[PDB]
Amino acid sequence: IEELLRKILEDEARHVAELEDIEKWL
Amino acid sequence: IEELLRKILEDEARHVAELEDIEKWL
Amino acid sequence: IEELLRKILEDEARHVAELEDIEKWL
Amino acid sequence: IEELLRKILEDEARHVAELEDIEKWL
């Protein structure tokens, strides 16, 4: 469970950064 | 932008799958 | 923990649908 | 599209916060 939660956390954080990039590009 | 959005949304769908498995394990 | 996981699951699923909308609109 | 993306990314940031709390509770 620990490893899976860490991976979701990582990916969610990356999404914030990617979506902020998209917002700026749009 | 379209390709990046698709990668993000596919990962969001994987999060549903992973969270559902965490629910089962808990 | 159960209630919080359910809410994240719900929201992730909604994001798939919203992001697929954005993909179509773009 | 920009407003919707902002709502999504703000929720992604909340998921990091919520997942981190779940880690602590577990």
Ligand SMILES: [Zn+2]
């Ligand atoms: Zn995400």
Ligand SMILES: [Zn+2]
């Ligand atoms: Zn991702």
Ligand SMILES: [Zn+2]
């Ligand atoms: Zn992921």
Ligand SMILES: [Zn+2]
């Ligand atoms: Zn499953």
Ligand SMILES: [Zn+2]
């Ligand atoms: Zn999401």
Ligand SMILES: [Zn+2]
């Ligand atoms: Zn949301």
Ligand SMILES: [Zn+2]
């Ligand atoms: Zn949420």
Ligand SMILES: [Zn+2]
């Ligand atoms: Zn916290």
